[PDB]
Amino acid sequence: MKSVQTAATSWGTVPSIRVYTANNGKITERCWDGKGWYTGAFNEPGDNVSVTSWLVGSAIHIRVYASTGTTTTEWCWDGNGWTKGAYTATN
Ligand SMILES: OC[C@@]1(O)OC[C@@H](O)[C@@H](O)[C@@H]1O
Ligand SMILES: OC[C@@]1(O)OC[C@@H](O)[C@@H](O)[C@@H]1O
């Protein structure tokens, strides 16, 4: 709880960058697409965050893993807004 905790992903050649910050129990998103940093649409509960992303042709897919206690919730971006993913784990 001494400092915020971040996770970062990027794609393409511009590039696009997404940086997720866990702070005081919530995870927010800052975005770069070549022109300046702006606040993204992702905001969900969590004390810890990790991220991965992959391209399928021209489509970006992002997975954000948000954890509180022993429960990790996966959030998915597949072109049409964030949706909850199927990830589970018994921690
Ligand atoms: O505005 C850019 C945006 O749509 O890019 C994809 C995701 O990173 C979203 O949370 C974000 O708002
Ligand atoms: O399209 C969503 C989904 O199927 O993508 C692959 C994995 O991230 C799954 O947990 C997730 O539900």
Q: Which ligand is nearest to the CA of 75?
A: 2
Q: Where do the domains of the chain lie? A: 5-84
- Ligand 2 atom with minimal separation from the 85 CA: 12
Q: Which ligand is nearest to the CA of 82?
A: 1
CA distance linking residue 91 with residue 55, whole number of Å: 30
- Among 69, 70, 65, 68, residue whose Cα is nearest residue 87: 65
Q: Whose CA is nearest to atom 8 of ligand 2?
A: 85
Q: Are 5 and 64 contacting, i.e. CB atoms less than 8 angstroms apart? A: no
> Who's near 24: CB < 8 A, 6+ residues apart?
none
On whether the 5-84 domain is CATH 2.60.120.10, my answer is no
Q: Are 32 and 17 contacting, i.e. CB atoms less than 8 angstroms apart? A: yes
Determine if ligand 2 sits within 6 Å of the CB of residue 86: yes
Q: State the resolution, in angstroms.
A: 1.2
